[PDB]
Copies of this chain bind each other. A is one copy, B any other.
Amino acid sequence: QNVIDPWIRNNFVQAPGGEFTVSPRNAPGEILWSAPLGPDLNPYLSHLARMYNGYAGGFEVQVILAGNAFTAGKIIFAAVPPNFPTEGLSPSQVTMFPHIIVDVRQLEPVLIPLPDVRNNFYHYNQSNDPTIKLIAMLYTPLRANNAGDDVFTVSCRVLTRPSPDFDFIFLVPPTVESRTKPFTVPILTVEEMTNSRFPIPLEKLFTGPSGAFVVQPQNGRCTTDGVLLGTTQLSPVNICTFRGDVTHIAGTHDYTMNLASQNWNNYDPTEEIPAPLGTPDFVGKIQGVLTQTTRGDGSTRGHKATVSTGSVHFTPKLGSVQFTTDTNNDLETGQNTKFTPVGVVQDGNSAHQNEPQQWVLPNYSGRTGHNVHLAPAVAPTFPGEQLLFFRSTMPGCSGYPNMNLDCLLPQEWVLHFYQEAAPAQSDVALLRFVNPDTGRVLFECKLHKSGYVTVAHTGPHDLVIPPNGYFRFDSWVNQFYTLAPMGN
């Protein structure tokens, strides 16, 4: 026995994840929108549910469309019982459920009740018990090609309010570990982020085709659930830093370095990670400073050094890496050393701007086997959109190296995702870039659960954005969302 604010029961508010779009590309029978019946579909009820433990009641749902007077077609909303398969439901059969048919040209909203049916007294918030699922799908083919141009997108909005019999059961403190925390995105500006695959600051955003080359980086990969994938660290200082023992090679200036750990501990080759944490993810020659710190005397004399990834002597998985330097005598093998990255360089004997091939993965285990336990590849699926890369440039020292560098997620985003561990309600979350000076939205992008960002645009392009813009999270949408044109 409990009561909520009387205003909530007498007004309609937008459901956090209740936005969807229809385009002529969508055919009848495809599922457009789906939502379980829970307190999370009403912002006030979602906020209150963090204070209580059990909901018990139905809803009233209101649908608003936005269509021009040229477009024609019908959209059917229906309620599906607690344990009923929804795969293969033809548009004819779905009418047998309680349903409403809404014309696209309908100015007014349409109402529908959602009475809760169950065999239990009440549900639990930290449980997955099936409930009535509200679905919305196309009824007749949509025809809007005549109107305007491009692909006329008709928008939808879903509002909800609680039924008079809705009530909560038990009162509990709102705790951090509740597993009900809403998903959020850091409000940091794009220019202050840190590149996840090299210690350099971000500068811009990029869009372009990805069909000409395979995208599968092992750095900057982290799902929205806070699970780290591939070979990703938290600290942006140990991105490409090696620490361990060093041995001189007589007759030349090359050195062989055996990696120990990030904490100067014994290396574990039995781990399922593809390569030791903090290894480079690109084929190229990297120039930096190697520093040896003798414990007794502090003989800290730095030396210029280079490492050429992708060569036959680069086997980080086995625990051996080759360094090329200028002095072959001024190093003592009895003390551990570390390597600090500085930049990349290009072999002048090859074509200009060719040495750094970010996409190509170097052979971590040399000639003894092919790399294993790699992060899954990333590629867009919905036609008409391209990946969004966070683009920066590393400094150069010699040759003409390729300045371009792209990372899927900034280091701050990875850190925040790891810290939050917020459960994902779907596979795709919708993010809008917002200018805080006026509040206008510049463009929309979809953040997939696998840890990448997609935006609807064709051809290479450099996004033009104000220096103070930031990303904001709005809702969870399914893969059928027709993303609005970017246009910047």
Contact = CB atoms under 8 A, between A and B. Distances in A.
Nearest to A122: B119
Contacts of A127: 83
A159 B95 contact: yes
Given A29-B439, A147-B146, A398 B92 contact: no
Contact of A175 (B6, B88, B439): B88
A141 B3 CA distance: 37
A67 B68 CA distance: 11
B74 A343 contact: no
Instruction: Please tell me the size bucket of the interface on A.
Output: 35 or more
Interface in A14-33: 14, 16, 19, 26-31
A332 interface: no
A140 B442 contact: no
Contact of A484 (B141, B153, B270): B141
Majority-rule SS of A interface residues: loop
A322 interface: no
A173 interface: yes
A400 interface: yes
Contacts of A236: 194, 235-237
A236 B483 CA distance: 35
A352 to B, nearest CB: 6
A304 B141 CA distance: 56
A184 to B, nearest CB: 7
B50 A88 contact: no
A203 B6 CA distance: 55
Contact of A69 (B47, B70, B96, B238): B70
Nearest to A143: B148
A472 B177 CA distance: 13
Contacts of A440: 26-30
A448 interface: no
